[PDB]
Structure formats: C-alpha cells, structure tokens
Amino acid sequence: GTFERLLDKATSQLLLETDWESILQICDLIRQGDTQAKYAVNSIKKKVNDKNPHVALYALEVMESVVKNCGQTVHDEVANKQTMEELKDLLKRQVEVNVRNKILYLIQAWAHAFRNEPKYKVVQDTYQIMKVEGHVFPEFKESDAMFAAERAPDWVDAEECHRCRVQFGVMTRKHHCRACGQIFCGKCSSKYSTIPKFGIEKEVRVCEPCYEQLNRKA
Ligand SMILES: O=P(O)(O)O[C@@H]1[C@H](O)[C@H](OP(=O)(O)O)[C@@H](O)[C@H](O)[C@H]1O
Ligand SMILES: [Zn+2]
Ligand SMILES: [Zn+2]
C-alpha cells in the first residue's frame, strides 16, 4: 500500500509544511501505472474534505500536482460536474483564507488549461459563475495552466493528397494541415484555424476534418 502511505504522509496533521518528495512519488506511481487515476483522485478527495484545514490544504496541494503532472486520465477525474459541485460546496463552508484561495486558484487554473475542450466546459462555467457571484480569484499566471498543452505534429511527406489522393506535381502543389500534420492539396486544406491545444493562437492552415473538430471545440 505505497500510494496510501505516501498520501497519508503528505497530508498528515503533524506535517509542518508541504512534503514535496512524497507528492512527486505519488505522481510517479500514477504515471508508472501502479495506482489508477480514479482511485488516486477519490482518495485525495477524501483528504480534501478533512475537518482540519491544514490537512485539507495539503490535500489540495496533492490534487494540484497530480492534475498538473499526470495527464488526461487524472484531468478527466477533476474536470467534471461532480468535482465542480464538490469544490463549490467546499468553498461555501471554508472559513480559512488559504483554503478558499487554493480552491479558487485551482478552478481558475483548470478552467484555463481545459478551455476549448467541450467535455470540460463545466470547469470554465464554474469559474464564470463564481466570478459573476463576486468571488475574487488570485491573479492569473498563464504559467500555471500550460500543463495540458502539446506540441503540433510533425509534417508528413507523400506524393498524393491525403484526402482526395490527387497526385502532387509542379502545378498541384503541397500544403500541410498544422493540426494533424498530413499533406494536402490546396482544395483539401483551404481552412484556417487557431490551435490553442498546441499553443497556436494565430490562424493557420488546416484540413476540413481538423477545422470542424476545432470549430465545434469552440
Ligand atoms: O511553395 P512550395 O514549393 O509548393 O512548398 C510547399 C509550401 O511551403 C507548403 O506550405 P503551406 O502548407 O504553408 O502552404 C508546405 O506545406 C509544403 O510542404 C511545401 O512543399
Ligand atoms: Zn485534395
Ligand atoms: Zn488536419
């Protein structure tokens, strides 16, 4: 029961200050596959709801790290209605400022990190409604919300268009979709889109399948 010992250690009400080494080890356990994301997150959540606010805050610190460091299987456990309702309720009953601030901080950082994913829109909606209702968030640093970004794919070379298979030549020239990296003729890659996921906020050439995925993602 390594995960459980580490989580107890990291959230102890005898712990003076945050135990980063246990937290990094917990993240490694989830990344290596030794602890499954669902179980890990549910376990951390039990600690978040502890009556002692030192334990609760240490638990939120574990939650922050596992979300930042462990990928989509952990994102999917927090970026949902159930967790947003739980955090709103936890916020409502907090008296200690550092705990209230940490919850607000996380809602905001996650809302940014998960923006333009329809599945996770409930996080942005929670941020928006808390802001509307007068909750003052800590100052946002974009650096706290880059953890889900990926880089754009490498480009493929081929002698025909990936979509229509027209053969490239001197007068049928090559283009690429920045979202999938495939190679296209001009007719098949006429769309332009940003690609927030890859850090692209300029409008860049995409194919129609990628344009629609990204269009409906916005
Ligand atoms: O000007 P060309 O000699 O046809 O060169 C092509 C362009 O630079 C294309 O840019 P684009 O995707 O921005 O249109 C690029 O995708 C192709 O791979 C190149 O072969
Ligand atoms: Zn084509
Ligand atoms: Zn594409």
From Swiss-Prot:
Residues 10-138 form the VHS domain. Zn(2+) 2 binds at residues 177, 180, 207, 210. Ubiquitous expression in adult and fetal tissues with higher expression in testis and peripheral blood leukocytes. Zn(2+) 1 binds at residues 161, 164, 185, 188. It comes from the Eukaryota. A zinc finger (FYVE-type) spans 155-215. This is Hepatocyte growth factor-regulated tyrosine kinase substrate. The lineage of its organism: Eukaryota, Metazoa, Chordata, Craniata, Vertebrata. The chain holds residues 6 to 223 of 777 of the full protein.
